[PDB]
């Protein structure tokens, strides 16, 4: 049983939820966590979805090395792990473990791209990267090693690369919202937050109500020609002139599982959206000692067969050594969206009892309706999870016009949406001031930064001033405390 | 065009074949190679096959960390890469990159397994490992980083673990023989060659005729209780007694692509078995300037649609800036098994010309027969590739009775099958003597080791003596030079 309450000790609740459901295991190297099959299966599902979608765009998978030479990493010139010795033997030149693969892939890119006919070049890989920070890790959300995909494309024109950046960002919206039922906000990162060496960084941002923090959910960068200049990636037009390619890179990580967990979980533990649950329906037979158990289990198997014909993912928990009470809790903690109960009374009526994980609502369903009804219930659970989260997201954002409204909204664990002049020095000043005010507050018991400049801009009245400098406002920006 | 001949400069031929077909790219860190999509797709295919098959056995995927602490690696107590510094900051205790994950996973195993009801525990992961040897690498076959899967299971009894070892070894036979059309020999490794700390190691072995070398294709270990003792992995029976679990581990790598390449390739370059080719049929339209090109390309698209309805994997190379001659060679080098040619004369006859990659045989096929006929041709190419390789394998093995027959058979680039007493010291002596004889031979221009003790044992006459000690022979053993 999960016992910490999500709304009272959030970090303990999260730890319990992911450990008791068998999603993660601890490890003797700090900041690394084991992903057990119950979490792993969800990764496999979103991985298959995203793979299928990028294949339709002509992206192909590949595999580049996990090591990068010191001097190719220096061509770009920090949380980088260095390998220095093969066993006992010191290396002649230390090599780093990839934190990202731009400097690993792009010398190959330069070799492969010769003519405009070679473009676009579109590659992805699934692997893990390492970012070795000493700060406190958080399972899924901030870990020293994490699984991701990174996609890396090259085009003849800037407009083609930017269209691809936005197509991918839309795939990331679908990954969170369609697969994980997590609402996200599209937008552009500020100049100070954008990717090192990139031209423009787009993001989808999510929000964790319980601690008021925004979290970057996925990212899609217009690199433009910046890395092409660095690595001499050029193509020939049909007339023979050499031109720089225009590039994109984009990535999504197992952080997405963390965000799903926190968005949908409740005081009983995990709640997994039907579209990614590896077990959508757990069938629990009632097994009175004074019953035809063989008949009950037989009907369970028949119902499994029937539901699987509709591509529903079913498990029968027929263990006689645990009570139905124990099983209910066990599969609740694990987040299975639908529980189906079959005992002698149901068998005699030709119905089953079905309980949905998100609300506890129970239904009596005849066996003949079971597949279409469960399909409909699963789509309804998925939509409900998403819409309720969308409502919490919207309740979480305060639209302000002056800096004096910031700290009251932060103290409500809200994000703010404010008219901003987009001066980078002002973002630095806002970070430092809000951090100071937070510290001063904590003495009586930090920083607010930009999360993104949303694509969907509310109306900007003609003379509106930046909320912090009083200069002309340029656009609405979303700010908050952040991961 | 590939220009080195497979039968004359084998290593140059292999390099050309994998580079010119765009399968691999070089990298500035020795012993690591980039896998471009043309090779990567074949990995994805065999990966899907093996995943599907182990899932039916109840194995589930997971992901364990890439790092292992010095002292958990010492619990077992060398080609191990050590991480010592996060950027500038020296680590308090150096950590190694995984060469294999037994010591990473098995402390978790010990924590998770409490009762016999917890068994069997069956996990797999797909990742890369590093084995940092200074010797000369070979793309796919011996690399410093390589992709694999490793599966790790734990059972209540030794017989259950051994049945699983053999079930997996059969999956590896299917991986090579059914998917890659590469014949392999099942058997048990000798005491000196078996896995460190394991009880018994089984293998499937392949043979490379052009250099006479056996190569271990995949491996499936009975660990028995050895690692359970090391890591305290114990379970409780129903009466409450604690017993050691019995374990297996097993792995397969991208070496398998290397073996496929070398087995089927010819002087024109790659030949890819239809069951794993990412392009099974390349459609090449003839594009005379004085023709209805639109009609020709339209019919190409229709034929693609029709073939894809039969799950055939099709690409249309409709580029006008290359000749059909150039395209024929380009897709030959890449190993596409079937080429389909459509020009105005074919269109007028309602037929297509189809050329198979392995023999060059051409066929005229009416459009109505095209899907069933190509399906049949692809199964015939797959079978032919396999049977011819099976014949080369069989021609490659000499059955001997005395040590004086070894060097003549090695000089024929053959393996030998000999009655052996299985004394480990004799294997060491045979390695050293055959290496010396080889050196002495090379002066006028090394080692033979056991490859496996085959499951399929030829008849052993009642008084047959070991071929090297003259002691009683125990079993037939397969020996050869080796990777
Ligand atoms: C208060 O204490 C902290 C403050 N700041 C950092 C940490 C921290 C602690 C650690 F122990 C280890 C690390 C290193 N891992 C990461 O930084 C990281 C980044 C991301 N990112 C970055 C943005 C991105 C998106 N979208 C990009 C696509 C990639 C995405 O997913 C995802 C994950 C799982 N890990 C950070 C702790
Ligand atoms: C004459 O020069 C040499 C002599 N001896 C070694 C090398 C060499 C050169 C290097 F630069 C790097 C390395 C390290 N990589 C590997 O040892 C290795 C082993 C395997 N293995 C081992 C057995 C196995 C099977 N079945 C097990 C499942 C795993 C399987 O696939 C596969 C691959 C791709 N790499 C070795 C060079
Ligand atoms: O790390 C990043 O943000 C980009 C996207 C994945 C590859 N590099
Ligand atoms: O390296 C080996 O041979 C075994 C099988 C994969 C995991 N460890």
Numbering used by the authors:
A (entry chain A), B (entry chain A): 333 to 409, 417 to 784, 793 to 830
Show passages lifted from the paper.
Aminoacyl-tRNA synthetases (aaRSs) are an essential enzyme family for protein translation and, in several cases, have been validated drug targets. Among the aaRSs, prolyl-tRNA synthetase (PRS) is a validated drug target in Plasmodial spp and Toxoplasma gondii (Tg). In the current study, we examined five ATP-mimetics L95, L96, L97, L35, and L36, based on the 1-(pyridin-4-yl) pyrrolidin-2-one (PPL) scaffold. We successfully co-crystallized all five compounds with TgPRS (L95, L96, L97, L35, and L36) and three with HsPRS (L95, L96, and L97), all in complex with L-pro.
The five PPL derivatives were buried in a ligand-induced fit model between the ATP pocket (470–483) and the loop (528–538). The second half of the binding pocket consists of Phe485, Phe 534, Gln555, Thr592, and Arg594. The phenyl ring of Phe485 and the guanidinium moiety of Arg594 support the adenine equivalent of the 6-methylpyridine core via a π-π stacking interaction. The compounds are stabilized by hydrogen bonds via the O atom of the phenylacetamide group and the keto O atom of oxopyrrolidine interaction with a water molecule. Furthermore, in L35 and L95, the 6-methylpyridine N atom interacts with the main-chain N atom of Thr482, Benzyl-formamide (L96, L97, L35, L36) or phenylacetamide (L95) N-atom interacts with the OG1 of side-chain Thr482. The oxopyrrolidine keto O atom interacts with the OG1 of side-chain Thr592 in L95, L96, and L97. The superposition of holo-TgPRS revealed no striking steric or sidechain rotameric conformational differences among the five PPL derivatives bound structures of TgPRS complexes. The high potency of these inhibitors was evident from their nanomolar IC50 values for TgPRS, i.e., L95: 139.9 nM, L96: 79.7 nM, L97: 50 nM, L35: 9.2 nM, and the exception of L36 with IC50 of 2409 nM. However, three out of five PPL derivatives, i.e., L97, L96, and L35, were found to be selective against TgPRS as opposed to its human counterpart in vitro, with enzymatic selectivity indices of 27.9, 13.5, and 8.2, respectively. For TgPRS, we observed ΔTm (°C) values of 22, 23, 20, 26, and 14 for L95, L96, L97, L35, and L36, in the presence of L-Pro, respectively, compared to the apo-TgPRS.
